[PDB]
Design a protein around this ligand. Structure first.
Ligand SMILES: OC[C@@H]1O[C@H](O[C@@H]2[C@@H](O)[C@H](O[C@@H]3CO[C@@H](O[C@@H]4CO[C@@H](O[C@@H]5CO[C@@H](O)[C@H](O)[C@H]5O[C@@H]5OC[C@@H](O)[C@H](O)[C@H]5O)[C@H](O)[C@H]4O[C@H]4O[C@@H](CO)[C@H](O)[C@H]4O)[C@H](O[C@H]4O[C@@H](CO)[C@H](O)[C@H]4O)[C@H]3O[C@@H]3OC[C@@H](O)[C@H](O)[C@H]3O)OC[C@H]2O)[C@H](O)[C@H]1O
Ligand code: CA
Length: 894
């Protein structure tokens, strides 16, 4: 956010500078559009970076017609550039023209509004009053910037200022060939993924989020770089994530430095990056370079996450959902070329049936082909963000994958999916323990290879604390895991890694599932053609207290006897056609809508494996058992592999368990973690033992546990009080021979690292350790300085005791170039020194920079780094001649 008068003068100062660059034969290193080309940032070969505005801020007042604002431009005459005002020469006293390039100043004509409310223009001592200013929308003096060929870059104006071409810098570094062909980082049951968010809402230092993830988890992790689509509804402009490209770039470099996988620019229609309609645009269109760039330069980049694609379409500043699907059609090809994933996540309401994962492939036949053909690259995820329809949306998201249109299936859980005011069981606020249930249920019984989140990131995963002292009198920003992150999430993944929780393959799920619905309906409302049959789940796994479809407010199943029921558009391949029972929805209203008849046919397909009010589903020798109701709840489960007779289970509310049957052993992973520290009680009884059993228990993470044992009349009874997760082992043998046989250890394969990133590293000043600085801007959007990288910058300031430090890295020993992007608006700063590894190496030339709020500059140093960690400091020695600002540093090999 900024005033119209700032915007105008910025463009003028830019026009002066472009002309200066032209006659000094300077080159454009980089340019990039923002807010769909409302503004651009521009870097030249001398390191000068500045904004130009294609849209000007409204003029405070309220009026909203287009009205007059002065237009300072430039024409050429007798070989020379002179200032224009509204397409006539700019003159003051006499009729003397005024050169752009005058041998004394770098003062441009300044436009203003005086105190009688008239526009004015001043140039040194001279000054000129023009027309009355008037509240209204204004038009910019500048149109846009495009590229000509691969040589030229053109700046075009809206007045009669000529076009201005500058050469497009070519860098003499040999470009690094990208990764193509096969998938960069395969995902499968053997190689699952956790998407952990570096979140614009946490105002992250990516480096410190990465480090909060332990080593055993890291290799299975895919860091998800979240750009918030929070914006000003009137203008369109993004705040939280002001410069999305620049955040993504900065954090994607840190990821690439740390050799970890990474991928998120949209929520609903809103997106920091412009949608395409043709595959050609990925190379030919200077409005959409970001797509190719991330794949080309970062070998750890897996692609793009379009989350929550159910809202915000057809906005003034979004796109239609059709246009989005179309963008996916092209983007998916791009993704396939580079071995990437495109991820989509859906949560549902009544208004959004026509944009769900059925409609996705049923409404757009071209996307359907491109999806089918590159399913390996396409990942479809259930989101738990909306207030209803969870079983419908679970079926459909699962159906996408099994039917062959997506390669992997995932869950993105959210607190926000707890029912509002009343909640569930008598618990107003969402309790974290609840979250473990859907996830384990859908991972173990429906083949999810991707866990995403959980949300909200900043309530469930990480928070920033106050700054902390880190030696030598320096202080740093700091981040911490929430306890439920460690005690639910981290530990649940350890239980996948350690092969307790075996993820079934697609073909394994179809054999279990048995049945599919095909959505072959073309008549009726949006719900009739894209959503599942309304009473699909009734008298199956849907609770008594809950209701059908959009009155389905609870995601806990009443029973696990019947498997999650998938709903697809079509079956694309051999395997999808191996479904035992294919039911067309058109027949559904006739036959299956009678709840009793459905339950009758389903009962023949899916035998009773237990009784009681707990949730119990079995796959191979693994049970998921949980309690999603109030009060102690029970079940009687006859064993299928263990040689004892049966187990009777009695569990507290929101206790979840994973129970592995062995001929002479049982394991329980149990959890029910409350951060406030309460205990819960659980009771396990084994029947049919022909021997005194024994038991073993280990607490996990920050959990507690005590277990009591009771042998009596051939019943063995374990009483497990605990807070948080634990593994319990029961050695119990019986005398049965009618029992199945346990297959050998499922595979878990530790996912390979990405190739080593050979490009430049970046370290944002707002993440530096610091002492005695004037101001540290971690949330820049609300402050006066524009055109910065990531979310912020700092004002180092003039203190003689001012200093900063970060830890930087180097693939090996040698000379590197350190580019400090900075601002020195009032005076040159010759008074700050640089230390590498606690040895002073020079005094960067921080030349006076232009006063304008968008201008930054870059100061260079050559230095020796050694292989691995290096320490970087900037230290004042005296009082600065003026404020020094710092946005970042960028390190590259010479
Ligand atoms: O960048 C942050 C980023 O966000 C992600 O994480 C979460 C998000 O998951 C989520 O985002 C919110 C999603 O829900 C929006 O609310 C829904 C909007 O549409 C409403 O439907 C209309 C009802 O009336 C009808 O007549 C009308 O026709 C319907 O709309 C049309 O429906 C079909 C569409 O195809 C069509 O385009 C649309 O126009 C719907 O009822 C409403 O319901 C929501 O309420 C909750 C209930 O649990 C659910 O979110 C959903 O059911 C929501 O936007 C709302 O907030 C304001 C707008 O700012 C309005 O009230 C409404 O539009 C999204 O909110 C915004 O997300 C971005 C964030 O930066 C904003 O601050 C936030 O307001 O929840 C929040 C977010 O944390 C990423 O992981 C995270 O990094
Ligand atoms: Ca910065």
């Amino acid at each position: 956010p900024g005033t119209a008068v700032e915007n105008i003068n910025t463009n003028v100062k830019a026009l002066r500078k472009l002309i200066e660059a032209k006659q000094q034969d300077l080159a454009v290193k980089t340019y990039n559009p923002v807010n769909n080309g409302a503004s651009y940032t521009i870097e030249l070969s001398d390191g000068t970076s500045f904004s130009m505005y294609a849209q000007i801020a409204a003029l405070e007042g309220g009026g909203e017609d287009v009205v007059y604002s002065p237009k300072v431009g430039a024409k050429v005459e007798h070989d020379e550039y002179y200032w224009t005002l509204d397409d006539v020469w700019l003159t003051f006293e006499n009729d003397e023209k005024v050169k752009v390039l005058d041998e004394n100043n770098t003062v441009a004509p300044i436009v203003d509004i005086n105190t009688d409310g008239y526009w004015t223009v001043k140039y040194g001592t001279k000054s000129r009053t023009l027309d009355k200013a008037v509240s209204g929308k204004l038009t910019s003096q500048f149109k846009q910037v495009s590229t000509i060929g691969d040589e030229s870059v053109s700046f075009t104006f809206t007045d009669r200022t000529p076009v201005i071409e500058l050469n497009l810098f070519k860098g003499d570094n040999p470009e690094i060939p990208p990764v193509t062909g096969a998938l960069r980082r395969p995902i499968s049951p053997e190689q699952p993924a956790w998407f952990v968010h570096i979140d614009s809402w946490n105002y992250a230092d990516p480096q410190k989020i990465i480090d909060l993830i332990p080593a055993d988890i890291r290799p299975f992790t895919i860091f998800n770089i979240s750009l918030s689509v929070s914006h000003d509804e009137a203008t369109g402009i993004y705040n939280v994530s002001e410069y999305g490209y620049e955040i993504a770039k900065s954090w994607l470099r840190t990821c690439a430095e740390n050799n970890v996988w990474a991928m998120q620019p949209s929520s609903g229609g809103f997106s920091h990056f412009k949608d395409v309609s043709l595959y050609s645009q990925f190379e030919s269109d200077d409005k959409v370079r970001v797509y190719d760039e991330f794949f080309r330069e970062y070998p750890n980049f897996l692609g793009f996450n379009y989350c929550a694609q159910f809202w915000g379409y057809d906005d003034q500043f979004s796109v239609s959902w059709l246009q989005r699907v179309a963008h996916w059609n092209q983007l998916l090809k791009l993704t396939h070329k580079y071995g990437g994933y495109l991820v989509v996540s859906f949560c549902g309401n009544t208004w959004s049936a026509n944009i769900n994962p059925i409609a996705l492939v049923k409404r757009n036949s071209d996307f359907a082909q491109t999806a089918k053909l590159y399913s390996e690259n396409f990942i479809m995820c259930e989101k738990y963000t909306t207030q209803s329809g969870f079983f419908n949306v679970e079926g459909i998201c699962l159906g996408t994958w099994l039917s062959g249109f997506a390669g992997q299936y995932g869950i993105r859980f959210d607190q926000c999916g707890w029912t509002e005011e009343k909640g569930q069981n008598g618990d107003k606020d969402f309790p974290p323990a609840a979250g473990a249930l859907p996830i384990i249920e859908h991972v173990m019984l429906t083949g999810q290879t991707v866990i995403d989140g959980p949300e909200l990131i900043w309530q469930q995963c990480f928070k920033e604390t106050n700054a902390v002292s880190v030696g030598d009198g320096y202080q740093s920003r700091n981040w911490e895991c929430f306890p439920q992150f460690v005690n639910i999430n981290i530990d649940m993944f350890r239980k996948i890694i350690d092969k307790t929780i075996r993820i079934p393959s697609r073909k394994e799920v179809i054999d279990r599932t048995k049945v599919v619905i095909l959505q072959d309906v073309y008549s009726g409302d949006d719900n009739a053609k894209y959503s599942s049959p309304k009473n699909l789940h009734e008298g199956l796994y849907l609770r008594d207290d809950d209701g059908n479809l959009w009155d389905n407010h609870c995601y806990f199943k009443k029973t696990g006897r019947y498997p999650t029921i998938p709903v697809a558009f079509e079956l694309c391949d051999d395997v999808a056609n191996s479904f035992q029972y294919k039911i067309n929805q058109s027949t559904f209203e006739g036959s299956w809508s009678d709840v009793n008849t459905k339950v009758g046919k389903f009962n023949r397909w899916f035998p009773q494996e237990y009784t009681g009010e707990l949730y119990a589903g079995r796959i191979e020798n693994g049970w998921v058992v949980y309690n999603g109701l109030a009060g102690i709840r029970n079940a009687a489960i006859p064993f299928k592999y263990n040689t004892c007779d049966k187990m009777e289970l009695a569990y507290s509310k929101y206790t979840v368990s994973v129970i592995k049957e062995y001929a002479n052993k049982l394991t329980f992973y149990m959890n029910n973690y409350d951060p406030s520290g309460s205990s819960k009680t659980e009771v396990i009884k084994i029947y049919g033992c022909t021997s005194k059993p024994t038991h073993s228990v280990s607490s996990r993470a920050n959990g507690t546990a005590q277990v009591s044992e009771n042998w009596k009349e051939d019943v063995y009874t374990l009483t497990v009080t605990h807070n948080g997760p634990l593994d319990l082992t029961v050695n119990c043998s019986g005398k049965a021979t009618d029992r199945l046989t346990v297959s050998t250890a499922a595979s878990i394969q530790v996912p390979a690292s990405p190739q080593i990133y050979q490009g430049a590293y970046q370290y944002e000043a707002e993440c530096f350790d610091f002492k005695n600085v004037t101001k540290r801007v971690t949330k820049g959007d609300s402050e006066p300085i524009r055109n910065y990288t990531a979310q912020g910058y700092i004002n180092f300031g003039a203190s003689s005791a001012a200093a900063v430090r970060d830890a930087v890295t180097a693939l090996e020993d040698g000379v590197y170039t350190i580019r400090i992007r900075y601002r020195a608006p009032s005076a040159t700063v010759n008074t700050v020194d640089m230390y590498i590894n606690n040895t002073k190496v020079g005094t960067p030339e921080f030349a006076q920079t232009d006063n304008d709020n968008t201008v930054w500059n870059t100061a260079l140093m050559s230095v020796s780094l050694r292989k691995g960690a290096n320490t970087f400091e900037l230290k004042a020695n005296s009082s600065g001649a003026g404020d020094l600002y710092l946005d970042n540093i960028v390190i590259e090999r010479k």
